[PDB]
Amino acid sequence: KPIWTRNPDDITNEEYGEFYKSLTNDWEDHLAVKHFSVEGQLEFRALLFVPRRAPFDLFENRKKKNNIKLYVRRVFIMDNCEELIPEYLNFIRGVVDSEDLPLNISREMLQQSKILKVIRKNLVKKCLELFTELAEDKENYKKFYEQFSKNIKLGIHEDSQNRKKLSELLRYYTSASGDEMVSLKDYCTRMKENQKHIYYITGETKDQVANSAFVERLRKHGLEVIYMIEPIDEYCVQQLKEFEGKTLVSVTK
Template sequence: HNKSLSLCNAFFRWEVTFKSILFVPTSAPRGLFDEYGSKKSDYIKLYVRRVFITDDFHDMMPKYLNFVKGVVDSDDLPLNVSRETLQQHKLLKVIRKKLVRKTLDMIKKIADEKYNDTFWKEFGTNIKLGVIEDHSNRTRLAKLLRFQSSHHPSDITSLDQYVERMKEKQDKIYFMAGSSRKEAESSPFVERLLKKGYEVIYLTEPVDEYCIQALPEFDGKRFQNVAKEGVKFDESEKTKESREAIEKEFEPLLNWMKDKALKDKIEKAVVSQRLTESPCALVASQYGWSGNMERIMKAQAYQTGKDISTNYYASQKKTFEINPRHPLIKDMLRRVKEDEEDKTVSDLAVVLFETATLRSGYLLPDTKAYGDRIERMLRLSLNIDPDDTTEDTEQDEEEEMDAGADEEEQETVKVYIASQEWD
């Protein structure tokens, strides 16, 4: 008890009579996720009429609660049956259901400071896995979730606290996924949201995005991945008219990008409502992968590249959003109006697309081509002929001569060996 975060002592008499003592340890057991789900947990010990029966059960507790320790004693379970038969006993399923509910209530009662500083650091991943796996308790588990957010530079927040702080008329919970907080909060996707004072949740663990995807909503508020389509803001009639005028102004550039410069790379090009500083961004559809999810899926050890569904999601074309206030975009519009066949502006469009791909969290399929384009643009900016090559040094010439001599020597050896074999 002295080494536990929380403890509960319960007595149930309904469909089945049993007593239980459960507690949460202060630290996670070693190898908590080794062979997750296949390894039997021996932390819950089952007694029948105070006679020890077993601690070798798969289903006494769900996988995600494999850290909970305790004792269960029931007078209603049979003594004279095998463990295998007992494991299928219908009363055991009732006991399991009650234990899970009691455990979640026990965790909920852990004081906030102790919960955030200790429990969440040790067992936060378990709660996220519970949201994914346990449909019947998903609402209860969602209230136990904690994430970093733009509200505070270091403290974590609950979804309840986020909803309490939501702006008037805000109907969605905004989140951004990345490999780190720094990556998430510096993403182009959060620029306007943060500028307008919206709070954004940062998902920085690989399991986080899976977890949120398993939650259709929280407290009546749906989740919005800000790296995907669907981010919209309330706007006045005047703002709407201004936006429509800008879209009309940039229509030549948008059509040129979609039909020519980026024809095989994007689904469409649109004027962005979410960018303030960045020139452009690559946005996934509602059912596509974010850059973070794509990285996770491609990093899976079992991925062979032959999975049909994986290839389908990975090959989905995305929306290219441009910032009409950015000087690069303004100059591109001017150049396209003057000459749609301008090779320099075509190169610029592709470089912007590839840069947006990286900044949006996606991987580039051809990094060499990207590097070559960057070098070509650097040459042009410095008035260096794109076709100029590097000059050979004396060392290069000597190495070429040595290589030629080596080839001649190898040919001589081959001829000698062939003549010996002929003799």
């Protein structure tokens, strides 16, 4: 039986790795795996993997198609179905096996398919669920975030429906964090009693921004400033107007 039709409880991580490596020709095994099924009026199984390295630089390679393999009742259909998952998750590798799709479905009907849209929404929900489970382990989440932080920020820009969950996955240096990147929830725990806004500064290097005088000003009060040191962060805070009810404020206003 194909591994994706087996019960996840009975599959070792070495069996997943072996399958992951034959599927992707990676020389390393997966960083993470999410194996699940939906049943009832919609019926399908999915076996998704996060690679240990970003497959390409996302921002210089926009609109790359995902490589998930689509099956119908265990018969391979295609492996470049754009609408199976949104672009910011196009690094996800693996297999989706649908029971209800037409076996003879063309790509143009696939594009219009209501079954494909409900499958896609389930993939996103389970990927985000995987990322949050991965955030429980601080050491391996650092590995994921180094490779895919740009994808999370691209999602914040492009996917308002999940913008809340995605924002919980962000990590940043701050004027109070030293060598560690922290979450917005962590920032919120340290806010002063009177503080009603989340302060950030955008810039180019950690050092130039840590030396900046707008930061020094708030350092003189008991106030923490978030370091946003990549160009997507501009787009990112535009749509991330606030968090936990706290408005985001640039220290340069």
